[PDB]
Design a protein around this ligand. Structure first.
Ligand SMILES: O=C(O)Cc1cc(O)ccc1O
Ligand SMILES: [Ca+2]
Lengths: 557, 206
């Protein structure tokens, strides 16, 4: 998910602009729900996933807010000491404590019912147990007990009118989530929200701790520790799930890393390119970053150095010159199915071969398979979420930086060979694979584009629509599931705010029993594909002026 | 009027709710949600509670068990019972507004029941506050704020220790899954602040 927020000093024709593309995958009906709420202290407009009570994306006429996933480490695993005799008990601070337990019955349409038990200790639910060691693992979340308060903090923040009131609510959201602020006077801010454990000295958060008592968290860290900035010296805030701040540790997932190779650099380059941006230019960063190959910038220098002494008729060199002429922006041909330049296919095959000769080789089976993906893996329906740089590729980037990388190379991933020799062998593997399928004339290579599917199944794999309700879009775009833009004190209007969004396929998912589809079932789908957007209304007079219908209810509690 | 809820939809079908108190405002919101997204909301409700196999069958039994093992419903109901009356209104108003449209739907199904309920063979049920809260918990806390691979990390570490020896196995683990990397691009510039904590990276807990 990405976000860029542009303040007073960088904004042109406005004091503040906020653009947000939360990335959750692409579904039918739409992941988010548009809603305006006027009364009881609330005066808001925006859209929010699964119609939660609190609006994750929108504004209240004075401030505006948005989010991206935080990925802090807020979950640790506790290795509980069981007993072969006295089962259902575990050792904790010198006594044998009994477990919480509940019984569940799964009813099954057209089958027999199944019943199982769930177990819980003071550290949390039991994930798995090793009867051989007599250990049971319990997953302990820092936000446990604060789920409902986090939902409410996301609802109350919609009433804030300044930074001080808004941060009061950010201090109560306990999930690992980045939160962003903008306001009518041109102030901008960011808070990496959530509850993080106050761990004992010597606790390495990437690995399990004994659940017997001595490794127990001391409590939670105060809100003053949460990474936060207000009116940054740069003039802007940008994030694409990258690190909040210097020295902040990331989630303990083995596949997740914050390293020198990071896709947020692609946004930074565009915001640093121009001294001031307009709203139209801030919106247009969605289009560029959507279409940008993420590996090009990282490994083009390495490819150039390795083929620099090669002759012009060496095909490894011709592959690197095609890459050298490219800006990395993918564009569809007129057929609607192949890309205009073969660069992403070349990087894909190169990187797969490079990882197999380097990272994969140093890791024992079957963990080697965690580091072999190039990051271009998809199917015919296309990626299920954003495109990112793969783990194996971030680890390989540190290795090709040499002693310029701060990460100690405990094993030489090039295994004694000079780098250039390994790059040239992978480049030969690439030429061999691609020329075989496409031929030797690089200029007529028409390589397959990634497409985009709005799925009928929700993110869990469960149907939320019939299979025919699936929608297909020819061009894959690395962008938010929805995009929304808020512009404060526009010099081009009399309104203090202007806001837009796009929620595709449409506002409604309704299909009558006779098969008649609601009028607003797919009227935003083509707008999504062409980078268009619709206006969000806030004031009564704008709502009245654009009203299509009205329904009044009279109800008493 | 305190009993009045006015719903205005714009040219894109987007609802705006006008009401004078909390309970009426969120009742309006729930009511338009049930109008626009009832089947999606009902399959999200079964997904976040693990009751998919009752309408969809035997392929979803493992799914349903996994959902149920990852949470403790009594701890959620206890948090709902500690809310103040104003906060509780948000959740109760929302579930009541949904219930109002679901009642009309189950009374006039020939024109108002979403086609997919006929297709998959079942009908909507009424919601309570617990169900509203579980939409947010299952799709925001539970999926997206619950990531860990600590047990798989330890099996990686153990296999690196066998291959390269005890100290060396640790140092390679730090090359592959570092704790921090000082050259990562950060949303906050270093001139504004840096994180103040330092962490153990030796697995000192064994
Ligand atoms: O980006 C993600 O993968 C998940 C996510 C996105 C977002 O915009 C807000 C919260 C969140 O968890
Ligand atoms: Ca952890």
């Amino acid at each position: 998910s990405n976000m860029w927020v542009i303040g007073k000093s960088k904004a042109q024709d406005a004091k503040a602009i906020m653009v947000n593309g939360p990335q959750f995958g692409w579904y039918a009906p739409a992941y988010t729900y548009g809603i305006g709420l006027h009364g009881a202290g609330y005066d808001v407009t925006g859209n929010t996933p699964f119609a939660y009570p609190g609006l994750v994306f929108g504004h209240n006429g004075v401030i505006s807010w948005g989010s991206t996933a935080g990925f802090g480490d807020d979950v640790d695993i506790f290795a509980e000491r069981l007993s072969a005799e006295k089962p259902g008990y575990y050792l904790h601070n010198g006594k044998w404590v009994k477990m919480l337990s509940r019984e569940e019955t799964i009813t099954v349409k057209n089958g027999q019912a199944e019943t199982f038990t769930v177990w819980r200790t003071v550290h949390g639910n039991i994930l798995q147990t090793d009867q051989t060691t007599q250990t049971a693992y319990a997953k302990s979340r820092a936000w446990d007990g604060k789920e409902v308060a986090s939902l409410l903090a996301w609802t109350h923040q919609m009433k804030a009118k300044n930074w001080q009131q808004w941060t009061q609510q950010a201090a109560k959201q306990a999930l690992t989530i980045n939160w962003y602020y903008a306001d009518v006077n041109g102030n901008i801010g960011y808070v990496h929200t959530g509850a993080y454990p106050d761990r004992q000295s010597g606790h390495d958060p990437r690995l399990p701790v004994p659940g017997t008592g001595k490794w127990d968290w001391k409590g939670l860290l105060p809100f003053e520790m949460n990474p936060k900035v207000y009116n940054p010296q740069s003039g802007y805030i940008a994030n694409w799930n990258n690190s909040p701040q210097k020295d902040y540790p990331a989630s303990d997932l083995f596949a997740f890393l914050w390293g020198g190779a990071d896709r947020v650099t692609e946004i930074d380059r565009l915001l640093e390119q121009k001294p001031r941006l307009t709203a139209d230019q801030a919106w247009d960063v969605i289009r560029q970053t959507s279409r940008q190959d993420l590996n090009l910038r990282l490994f083009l220098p390495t490819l150039q150095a390795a083929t620099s002494g090669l002759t012009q008729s060496d095909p490894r060199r011709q592959l690197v010159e095609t890459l050298t002429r490219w800006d990395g922006i993918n564009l569809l041909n007129d057929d609607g199915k192949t890309w205009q330049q073969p660069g992403s296919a070349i990087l894909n095959v190169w990187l797969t071969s490079m990882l197999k000769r380097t990272v994969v080789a140093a890791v024992p089976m079957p963990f080697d398979k965690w580091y072999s993906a190039s990051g271009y893996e998809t199917t015919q329906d296309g990626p299920t979420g954003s495109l990112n740089i793969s783990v194996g590729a971030k680890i390989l980037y540190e290795a090709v930086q040499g002693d310029k990388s701060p990460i100690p190379q405990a094993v030489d991933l090039f295994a004694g060979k000079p780098q250039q020799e390994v790059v040239l062998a992978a480049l030969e593997d690439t030429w061999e694979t691609l020329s075989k399928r496409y031929g030797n004339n690089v200029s007529n290579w028409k390589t397959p584009a990634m497409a985009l599917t709005f799925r009928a199944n929700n993110f869990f794999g469960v149907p939320q629509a019939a299979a025919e309700e699936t929608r297909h879009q020819a061009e894959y775009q690395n962008r938010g599931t929805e995009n929304d833009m808020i512009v404060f004190s526009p010099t081009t209007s009399d309104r203090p705010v202007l806001a837009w969004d796009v929620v595709a396929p449409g506002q409604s998912g309704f299909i009558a029993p006779d098969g008649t589809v609601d009028k607003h079932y797919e009227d935003q789908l083509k707008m999504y594909e062409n980078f268009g957007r619709k206006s969000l209304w806030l004031t009564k007079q704008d709502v009245e002026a654009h009203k299509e219908s009205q329904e009044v209810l009279h109800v008493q509690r | 009027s305190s009993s009045e809820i006015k719903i205005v939809r714009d040219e894109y079908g987007m609802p705006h709710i006008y009401a004078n108190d909390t309970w009426h405002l969120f009742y309006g919101y729930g009511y338009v949600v049930a109008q626009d997204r009832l089947f999606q909301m009902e399959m999200a409700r079964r997904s976040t509670q693990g009751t998919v196999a009752e309408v969809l069958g035997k392929d979803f039994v493992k799914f349903d068990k996994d959902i149920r093992r990852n949470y403790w419903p009594d701890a959620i109901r206890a948090q709902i019972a500690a809310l103040s009356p104003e906060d509780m209104s948000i959740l109760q108003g929302y579930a009541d507004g949904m219930n109002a449209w679901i009642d009309k739907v189950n009374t006039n199904p020939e024109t108002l029941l979403p086609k997919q309920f006929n297709t998959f063979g079942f009908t909507p049920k009424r919601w309570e506050p617990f169900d509203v809260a579980m939409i947010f918990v299952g799709t925001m806390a539970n999926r997206f704020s619950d990531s860990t691979s600590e047990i798989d990390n330890l099996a990686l570490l153990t296999a690196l220790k066998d291959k390269y020896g005890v100290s060396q196995g640790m140092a390679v683990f730090n090359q592959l899954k570092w704790l921090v990397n000082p050259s990562a691009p950060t949303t906050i510039a270093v001139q504004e602040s840096n994180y103040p904590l330092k962490f153990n990276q030796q697995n000192s807990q064994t």
